[PDB]
Amino acid sequence: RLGNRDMLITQGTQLDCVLETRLVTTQPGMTTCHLTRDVYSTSGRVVLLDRGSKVVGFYQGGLRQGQARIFVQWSRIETPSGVVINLDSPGTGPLGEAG
Amino acid sequence: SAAAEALRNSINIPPTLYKNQGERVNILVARDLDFSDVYSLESIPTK
């Protein structure tokens, strides 16, 4: 069973953020996006990540022949009120396809 | 062939670089340089 649904974000919650930096895979680098909407607890009663929070992540390895998507992971998020948590998740496209 | 043998042997020669004297060159100091132990400032008395 879950501990407290009012302060808990389960796996598979969908965070919608807008990419800040233009992405070029020629070198292993670092990314940045800002959340665009408030993100609630799975109970849907508390705003846990204030909209506009900053998200930092990275990638590596470049592509391989024929591959059409690069795989980025997001390291650390920041709520403008000072909250920092280490979420480690795979970056996706607008509809959530890998990479 | 003979051409292939000659070329395969004498193809890898490093290019030689020539530099004229009196050109401007610049140094980018890569490490902090301290002088506290060799220099000191004293005020020049007025008049």
Partner: peptide, 26 residues
């Protein structure tokens, strides 16, 4: 006569800091 975590092995390696020791004049 006599007396007697480290993941991102590519990136997190390319960000390896390179510190150079300072010097002092003589």
């Amino acid at each position: 006569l006599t007396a007697g975590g480290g993941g991102g092995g590519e990136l997190a390696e390319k960000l390896q800091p390179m510190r150079l020791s300072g010097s002092s004049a003589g």
